[PDB]
Amino acid sequence: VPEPEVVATPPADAGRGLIRVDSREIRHYSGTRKEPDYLVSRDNGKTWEMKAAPAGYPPNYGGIPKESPAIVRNPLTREFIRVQPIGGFVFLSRGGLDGKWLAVTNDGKLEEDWKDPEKRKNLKKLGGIMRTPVFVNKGRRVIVPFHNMGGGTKFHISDDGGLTWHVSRNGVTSPRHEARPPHQGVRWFNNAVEATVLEMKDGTLWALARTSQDQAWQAFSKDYGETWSKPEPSRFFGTLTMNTLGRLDDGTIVSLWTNTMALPENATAGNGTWEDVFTNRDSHHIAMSGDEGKTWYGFREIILDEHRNHPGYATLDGPEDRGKHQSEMVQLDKNRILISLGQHKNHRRLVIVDRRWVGAKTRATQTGKDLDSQWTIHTYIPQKKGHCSYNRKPSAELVQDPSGGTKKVLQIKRLDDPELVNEKSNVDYRNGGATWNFPNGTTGLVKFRFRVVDGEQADDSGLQVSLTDRLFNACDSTTKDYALFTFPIRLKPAPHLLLGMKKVPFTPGAWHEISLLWQGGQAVVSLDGKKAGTLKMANKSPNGASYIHFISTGSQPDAGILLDTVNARVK
Ligand SMILES: [Ca+2]
Ligand SMILES: [Cl-]
């Protein structure tokens, strides 16, 4: 069963503009300010080329150059509706995407002659930053989520195919972040923004929205979007990144999001009215549910950002926002889904994912072979660069296997690098680390092979090992406080595992295997095939474990430990 496959770079940041035309043709429109165009696949998503749009397709009067308008098919008429991410007009098609297009007027009529500037003055303009129109109530209503500068998500609502519009009575909100430890400042405040909506089988609507909390928040509507329930945390971890929900032909729900935890806010973060830095946008994830969201599986990494370790990350080809957050999906066939994801022309991708891969129960890795594609190891140079970015370094390096032979293995240690410190922001990212994804499970077995490096060690040198339910940065020493299960490997006074107050010795100069067998609220730890002790769950999870996280613990430069293989099996 195939791993995720990159097939192209979309012509706009992801999240809007991907649209199926027929059984073989799929398009991704653009935000171009010039003659409209689109990226097109004519082989159901495998290969792609740019094409100019025909003369009757409207230019982008609103929007912005890096974002396409949203294009959605009306399920009753099979025509299309188009809205921009911001500004511009409401366009409806007659005769398809390459047919005639009409703009909605303020008086509920349709305007054919929209290339006349004077006639554009009386066209309907929907306010706010908009996401994707969705058709609900047996196709008879269309809703467009939007947010303004402060009051949270609300919905533009039309009951006549988009000709006339009103606003929902309420929408979705979420609370402000508080500067409590480990935070030294406030996260940029987003009040339940950038919502995705799904119609559930019982007619209820589910809205899932981006927040300043550790997870997306959600609300539900029983009246097709007019009114919404009290907002609550969702099961999808992530902060200040976008969620997308969709449904496959057979009823299966798909959730796409960036399943990450940002580094704690530092001492120069503002009052929350603006963002200082993004440290959580270098991955994208997928989970699925076959039972209307009662249970979920997957939580797999679709892709890691190829540039994530780079010391020029923030400023290569301009300073604008980049990464793997934002996404849109189109099903290709029973087993395959096409996803557009990310921001910036060097980071944006179109990727094909297989559902059988989402449902897999095992994964294995060797650091020397798989570092580039599978391992998050970057630390940050904590100096603001570009638009809300930091440049990076790899925090851990491959070295020869001390035993001999051809394996390269990962050295995880406390770095001697003053560039990873910012005194005024009061942050220090010199502890190297590494983290790796596997399919989600509430029960599982993970095994890893490690060795103490033969050299000088500090008094607190070692490795904190954590099982987590989202991706924590390699250099984040607070991971243990949020982990499902966690324990330290200590190198001094002599090497040992610490399980509670139990010390379990092991030898230097030799490879060792540790296994973690978890079930419910307990994890059994084994060393070289012998039971070593049992760990109580530190944090409950709505989902289960889907990452193992390793971080050095030394406070002075040390030699650290080597990491070779990791294997996971879940049930
Ligand atoms: Ca911040
Ligand atoms: Cl943003």
Author numbering: 25 to 595
Mind quoting what the paper says about this structure?
Sequences of Amuc_1547 and its close orthologues populate a separate and distant cluster in the GH33 phylogenetic tree. Based on this as well as structural and mechanistic difference to GH33 sialidases, described below, the enzyme encoded by Amuc_1547 (AmGH181) is proposed as the defining member of the CAZy family GH181. To explain the strict specificity, we determined three structures of AmGH181: in ligand free form, bound with the transition-state inhibitor DANA (N-Acetyl-2,3-dehydro-2-deoxyneuraminic acid), and bound to both the T-antigen disaccharide (GNB) and DANA, which provides a mimic for a transition state-like substrate complex. The structure comprises an N-terminal catalytic domain joint to a C-terminal CBM-like domain. An inserted B domain between β-strands 1 and 2 of the CBM-like domain acts as a bridge by packing onto the catalytic domain via an extensive interface. A long loop in propeller blade 2 forms a Ca2+-binding domain. The catalytic site comprises a shallow pocket, flanked by a positive electrostatic potential. The active site is open at one side of the β-propeller due to shorter loops as compared to GH33 enzymes. The Ca2+-binding domain, the B domain, and two large loops pack onto the β-propeller to give the enzyme a “sun-chair” architecture. Comparison of the ligand-free and the ligand-bound structures of AmGH181 revealed the flipping of a tryptophan (W298, 56.3 % conserved within GH181) in the ligand-bound structures. This conformational change positions W298 to stack onto the GalNAc unit of the T-antigen, thereby defining subsite +2.
